[PDB]
């Protein structure tokens, strides 16, 4: 993975030695070159993973997450260069260095062969994200939101540290390749009960679990646009990646430990979706929709069937692209009206027709329109949870009504109706903004032509 780690590190002298008018264009160019090189991870086999070294490997789970991670950095640079145009030059370079450092932590989070190196990178991803939210967020509440984002994660994850070192002492290793072959059945006990909780609650916070999700509609709202893109597109998927690695070690106890959490997600995706019906803050509406979509990934991991893991990784990649595009659209209005209130600027299809087409496509992929990979992941999780219990389709289908209802109401409030009369600074869409929308949406629609690369280790 060192062919991806060293170019990401060389982005640091690339961004600190550039000319002052050149520090966006060079980083965008070479991050796009790294994302072009990211397709060499697709050397995946039907039997074996692509095992690079003692430290790094990549199966078909980490590979779409790595391509999405290396693809999201140029899009974050495009999104975050307008509102940081008036910024000091050294602080602008520090912002770009925090995004580069976060990508550098993420690409060896997803490729960590050993689980405590996974933990170290997985918790190293806090510090650039925390600094970005609490330094380049706009409002007052970013300090409090950074505290919530920090201390839900660490309160969930410092038990995970003790649990991983306990597995290290018991099994002798935390190599995932060794633990594929040395995994022992985890019997029913209270010791193994709190073992399961210490392995799972950090990722339950990262997904987020409903009830633990309170950090998210602050940390995804009080952040700048690049922070919201990396949080909702990648950093919610560290939890699903970690669960799909760690439930190997937690059998057969998971088969009854999952029952409360599944309820917390199956009811949670009813509640949070319903919350999106009555949100005034558009960025908070996208945040509670993110909680609603990640509840399905929690259910699909906790029922641990093949169709569920395929649908869960498809839904994670699809939700990454979709929610990142939705945050970028909310920023495209917020750079014009300077308020995140959704009822403020209405009827924007009368003024921005192509941007309203981007809103339409993002909302149709949000409501899981076939044959988008949003619907592929949605539908496969629905199939596997129907095999889990035939009643859950009700809680699925009612969700699939409300998921439609907030996706179009967001379209109806922002883009339709009569426009707001007193707002007259609605500029035409810049080429940068439509470029960002197309670089979100065109990969998302091209993946419908060949979805087997985003279906994970057991396609």
């Amino acid at each position: 993975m060192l062919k991806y780690i060293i170019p990401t590190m060389m982005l640091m002298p690339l961004t600190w030695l550039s000319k002052n008018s050149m520090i966006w264009i060079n980083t965008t160019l070479h991050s796009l070159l790294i994302s072009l090189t990211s397709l060499l991870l697709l050397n995946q086999f039907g039997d074996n993973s692509l095992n690079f070294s003692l430290t790094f490997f990549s199966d078909s789970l980490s590979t779409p997450l790595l391509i999405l991670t290396m693809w999201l950095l140029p899009l974050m640079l495009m999104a975050s260069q307008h509102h940081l145009s008036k910024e000091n030059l050294a602080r602008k370079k520090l912002f770009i260095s925090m995004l580069i450092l976060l990508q550098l932590f993420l690409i060896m989070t997803f490729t960590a062969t050993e689980l405590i190196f996974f933990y170290i990178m997985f918790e190293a991803t806090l510090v650039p994200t925390l600094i970005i939210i609490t330094r380049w967020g706009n409002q007052t509440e970013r300090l409090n939101a950074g505290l919530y984002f920090l201390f839900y994660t660490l309160a969930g994850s410092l038990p995970l540290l003790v649990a991983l070192i306990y597995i290290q002492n018991t099994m002798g290793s935390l190599n995932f390749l060794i633990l594929q072959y040395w995994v022992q059945p985890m019997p029913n006990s209270w010791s193994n009960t709190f073992m399961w909780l210490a392995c799972m609650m950090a990722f339950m916070v990262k997904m987020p679990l409903y009830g633990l999700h309170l950090w998210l509609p602050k940390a995804h709202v009080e952040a700048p646009i690049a922070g919201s893109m990396v949080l909702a597109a990648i950093l919610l998927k560290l939890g699903g990646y970690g669960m799909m690695r760690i439930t190997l070690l937690l059998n057969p106890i998971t088969d009854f430990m999952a029952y409360p959490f599944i309820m917390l997600s199956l009811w949670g995706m009813i509640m949070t979706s319903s919350i999106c019906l009555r949100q005034t803050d558009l960025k908070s509406l996208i945040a509670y929709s993110s909680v609603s979509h990640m509840a399905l990934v929690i259910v699909a991991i906790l029922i641990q069937t093949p169709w569920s893991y395929m649908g869960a990784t498809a839904l994670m990649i699809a939700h990454g692209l979709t929610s990142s595009m939705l945050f970028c659209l909310a920023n495209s209005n917020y750079e014009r009206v300077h308020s995140r209130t959704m009822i403020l600027a209405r009827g924007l299809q009368t003024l921005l027709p192509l941007m309203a087409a981007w809103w339409l496509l993002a909302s149709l992929t949000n409501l899981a329109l076939p044959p988008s990979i949003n619907l592929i992941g949605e539908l496969f999780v629905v199939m596997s949870t129907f095999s889990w219990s035939n009643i859950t389709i009700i809680l699925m289908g009612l969700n699939m009504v409300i998921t439609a209802l907030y996706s179009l109401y967001m379209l109806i409030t922002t883009q339709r109706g009569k426009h707001t009369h007193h707002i007259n600074n609605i500029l035409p869409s810049f080429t940068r903004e439509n470029a960002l929308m197309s670089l979100h949406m065109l990969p998302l629609l091209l993946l419908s032509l060949n979805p087997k690369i985003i279906l994970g280790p057991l396609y």
Partner: protein, 171 residues
């Protein structure tokens, strides 16, 4: 633990030297010159055995050789010896230097009638050799078996197999 072994009161009966300390101090240099051999045999046995119960008989020889020392004074030179230990006996610190003329008369009478030479300065403090027939104590401290030491280090030092083996570090 075990019962301590005390000797009988008959094993402790001996003819005592019932003289005062000024009598002993006045006759001390001639006692060290004449009663050398059984005294040094006893003190060799006393520092080697580290037990008075293993040193009774030699001790009795000391109490046998002292008395024969005094009788040989009492037969021949009772007057200068009495006149000398009385003068030694007057002093509260029992100084030899207060009594040099009675010392000279006692030494003259002893060297004439018995041939004893008083030891010079330095002689009675010498470390002497003693030829005994009793055996050397092989375990005078009655020490039991000592524990075996831990096994030492041996073998050429090879590198660490796969380095530190700390969690993910390869060196």
């Amino acid at each position: 633990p075990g019962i301590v072994e005390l000797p009988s009161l008959e094993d402790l009966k001996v003819q005592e030297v019932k003289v005062s300390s000024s009598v002993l101090k006045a006759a001390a240099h001639h006692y060290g010159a004449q009663c050398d051999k059984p005294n040094k045999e006893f003190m060799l046995c006393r520092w080697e055995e580290k037990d008075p119960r293993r040193c009774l008989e030699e001790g009795k020889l000391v109490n046998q050789c002292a008395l024969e020392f005094f009788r040989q004074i009492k037969r021949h030179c009772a007057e200068p010896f009495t006149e000398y230990w009385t003068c030694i006996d007057y002093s509260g610190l029992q100084l030899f230097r207060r009594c040099r003329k009675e010392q000279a008369q006692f030494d003259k009478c002893v060297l004439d009638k018995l041939g004893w030479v008083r030891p010079d300065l330095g002689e009675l403090s010498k470390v002497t050799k003693v030829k005994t027939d009793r055996p050397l104590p092989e375990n005078p401290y009655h020490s039991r078996a000592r524990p075996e030491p831990n096994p030492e280090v041996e073998g050429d030092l090879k590198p660490a197999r796969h380095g530190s083996r700390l969690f993910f570090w390869t060196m």
